[PDB]
Design a protein around this ligand. Structure first.
Ligand SMILES: Nc1nc2c(ncn2[C@@H]2O[C@H](COP(=O)(O)OP(=O)(O)NP(=O)(O)O)[C@@H](O)[C@H]2O)c(=O)[nH]1
Ligand SMILES: Nc1nc2c(ncn2[C@@H]2O[C@H](COP(=O)(O)OP(=O)(O)NP(=O)(O)O)[C@@H](O)[C@H]2O)c(=O)[nH]1
Ligand SMILES: [Mg+2]
Length: 414
């Protein structure tokens, strides 16, 4: 048998709208990540999607067919059990141009990524460029490029695009990243992709001794109709642990917390609770480490967690000292081009009184620029952000022609 363990790595799936990200995750894991009404009606990803799979290898078989996602080798001609390698998970991002901030929130959780490029569309499309640049900014450098939809183009066309893609990465951080052609729809060459994931997206080193921090991307009420009272539960909070670890029965807090009034002023009150349960996918555990999207059960009123109410928060231990800042100072750099627009315009300098969008961890917040210098801006936010370390990366967006566009990045200085 294979062990039941949490996923140990998060692989982002990014790329232009409809290039096949979600179909690819389904080809690997058997799971369709889209769970929301609007996603199903529109045929698009809106919220971050998630799926897990075990990975193993049939030692008696040849590669790539030796790589499997279930404990059997019958497909490659062996009655032996495959050797378990690890459990992996996917963070499935939206490709739509208006959902770039959601891709950025997911990118904060990624240990590596697959950039999906459709073989039957001109290259490079706007969000092919924009997601690529975002991965570079955030430092997600363990990248595989997947050339999808090869089932609907000729060999010649696929080869032409392949050369295009290699030339695009030439002279960039991604110069040596592999390109793997697949059909996600017809599940062609998925075994080569799993081999690629093992070779190029290794599980990173973790630091389990640092103060535990989880970035929150989901929160829910898990109580369903027709359930007996003794099976009812408190609110659940979902996210990825970026350092340290968490255990059942630990006292924790959610930051910045709840928006309340305190002395005629808006304030955020930290939400204190205790971990009642820990789950990854359909499995319960007593502790949770980095890797995977964990569901942290709490004793909170489910009205507090319902419908992603806490998206963008962080969870720490109750006694941790974490800055929660309404005003932030950013050591910044600007991109030269608005890469995500259909026509790449030049980026204008930041000016005082501009409203900008700041991506910090899993959070997205608007703020007004109160001060500009050569390498520093100060921003007054509409909601405070939890800043759990010094030199946390932020991505900066500006509204241009009715869309939020990534224009720069920086370090939050505390
Ligand atoms: N011919 C072909 N169609 C494919 C392939 N992969 C996906 N598609 C089709 O492309 C469309 C979009 O697929 P989807 O997986 O939703 O793409 P996405 O990149 O996740 N979209 P979004 O950016 O909105 O999340 C669907 O009609 C799907 O069936 C493929 O390998 N071949
Ligand atoms: N820690 C914890 N997580 C739970 C519990 N029940 C459900 N979850 C998690 O909360 C999330 C929401 O689950 P749910 O609202 O039941 O819908 P769901 O995700 O469709 N359920 P399922 O995936 O099993 O069909 C999932 O990640 C699930 O694993 C619980 O008792 N404790
Ligand atoms: Mg999708």
């Amino acid at each position: 048998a294979w062990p039941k363990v949490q996923p140990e790595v998060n692989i982002g799936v990014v790329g232009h709208v409809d290039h096949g990200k979600t179909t690819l995750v389904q080809a690997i894991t058997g799971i369709w990540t889209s769970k929301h009404s609007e996603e199903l009606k529109r045929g698009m990803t809106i919220k971050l999607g998630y799926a897990e799979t075990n990975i193993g290898v049939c030692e008696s078989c040849k590669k790539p067919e030796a790589y499997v996602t279930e404990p059997s080798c019958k497909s490659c001609g062996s009655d032996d059990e495959p050797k378990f390698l690890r459990r992996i998970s996917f963070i499935d991002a939206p490709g739509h141009e208006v959902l770039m901030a959601t891709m950025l929130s997911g990118a904060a959780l990624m240990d590596g990524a697959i950039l999906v490029v459709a073989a039957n569309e001109p290259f490079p499309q706007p969000q092919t460029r924009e997601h690529f640049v975002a991965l570079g900014i955030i430092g997600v450098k363990n990248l595989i490029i997947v050339q999808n939809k090869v089932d609907v183009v000729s060999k010649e066309e696929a080869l032409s695009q392949y050369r295009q893609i290699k030339q695009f990465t030439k002279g960039t951080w991604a110069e040596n990243v592999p390109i793997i052609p697949v059909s996600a729809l017809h599940k062609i060459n998925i075994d080569s992709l799993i081999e690629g994931i093992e070779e190029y997206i290794k599980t990173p080193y973790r630091d389990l001794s640092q103060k535990p921090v989880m970035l929150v991307i989901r929160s829910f009420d898990v109580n369903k109709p027709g359930t007996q009272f003794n099976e009812l539960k408190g609110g659940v909070i979902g996210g990825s642990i970026i350092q340290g670890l968490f255990k059942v029965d630990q006292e924790i807090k959610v930051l910045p917390g709840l928006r309340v009034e305190k002395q005629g002023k808006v304030s955020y009150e930290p939400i204190f609770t205790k971990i009642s349960s820990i789950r990854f996918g359909d499995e319960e555990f007593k502790e949770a480490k980095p890797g995977g999207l964990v569901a942290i059960g709490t004793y909170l009123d489910p009205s507090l967690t319902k419908a992603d109410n806490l998206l963008g928060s962080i969870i720490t231990l109750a006694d941790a000292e974490v800055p929660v800042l309404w005003n932030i100072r950013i050591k910044y750099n600007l991109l030269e081009r608005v890469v995500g627009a259909k026509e790449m315009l030049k980026v204008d300098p930041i000016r005082a009184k501009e409203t900008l969008m700041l991506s910090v961890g899993s959070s997205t917040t608007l703020g007004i620029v109160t001060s500009v210098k050569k390498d520093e801006i100060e921003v007054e936010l509409r909601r405070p952000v939890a800043v759990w370390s010094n030199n946390i990366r932020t991505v900066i967006s500006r509204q241009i022609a009715g869309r939020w566009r990534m224009i720069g990045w920086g370090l939050v200085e505390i």
